[PDB]
Amino acid sequence: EDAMTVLTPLTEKDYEGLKRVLRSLQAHKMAWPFLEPVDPNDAPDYYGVIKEPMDLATMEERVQRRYYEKLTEFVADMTKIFDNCRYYNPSDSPFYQCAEVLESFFVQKLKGFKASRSH
């Protein structure tokens, strides 16, 4: 990561752009498994093997409450969604496939956000 991502505090303007990126992810056709916390009936072993769960609704609450101070911290929560999914599920499963596509889409949107802060 560049120095601005790591060290520049998130301003009010920055937070309007975080809100946009998050709504883009929530609207993507492959986002369904990640909108809310994993339900233990879809997986009774999930919370014994993933010790730091994350989901888009928890990120939304943190954005609304101004939890994040630096962009790196926001990026780290989003990446945990995709890393948890690729660790838990086999590489041929549809859950794994959703993580591949959504992460690539997140990177496209993140690069747009970074450009907009610096110019």
Swiss-Prot record:
Give the similarity note.
Answer: Belongs to the PBTF family.
* Tissue expression summary: Ubiquitously expressed, with highest levels in testis. Present in kidney, liver and brain. In the brain, highest levels are found in motor cortex (at protein level).
Q: Which disease is it linked to?
A: Neurodevelopmental disorder with dysmorphic facies and distal limb anomalies: An autosomal dominant neurodevelopmental disorder characterized by variable degrees of developmental delay, intellectual disability, speech delay, postnatal microcephaly, dysmorphic features, and mild abnormalities of the hands and feet.
Task: Report which part of the complete sequence is shown.
Answer: 2919 to 3037 of 3046
Role noted for this protein:
Regulatory subunit of the ATP-dependent NURF-1 and NURF-5 ISWI chromatin remodeling complexes, which form ordered nucleosome arrays on chromatin and facilitate access to DNA during DNA-templated processes such as DNA replication, transcription, and repair. The NURF-1 ISWI chromatin remodeling complex has a lower ATP hydrolysis rate than the NURF-5 ISWI chromatin remodeling complex. Within the NURF-1 ISWI chromatin-remodeling complex, binds to the promoters of En1 and En2 to positively regulate their expression and promote brain development.
In the record's own words, the domains note is:
The second PHD-type zinc finger mediates binding to histone H3K4Me3.
Subunit record text: Interacts with MAZ. Interacts with KEAP1. Component of the NURF-1 ISWI chromatin remodeling complex (also called the nucleosome-remodeling factor (NURF) complex) at least composed of SMARCA1 (isoform 2), BPTF, RBBP4 and RBBP7. Within the complex interacts with isoform 2 of SMARCA1. Component of the BPFT-SMARCA1 complex at least composed of SMARCA1 (isoform 1), BPFT, RBBP4 and RBBP7; the complex is catalytically inactive and does not remodel chromatin. Within the complex interacts with isoform 1 of SMARCA1.
This protein is called: Nucleosome-remodeling factor subunit BPTF
PTM per Swiss-Prot/TrEMBL? Phosphorylation enhances DNA-binding.
Where is it located? Cytoplasm; Nucleus
Query: What residues does the Bromo domain cover?
Result: 9-113
Q: What is the lineage of its organism?
A: Eukaryota, Metazoa, Chordata, Craniata, Vertebrata
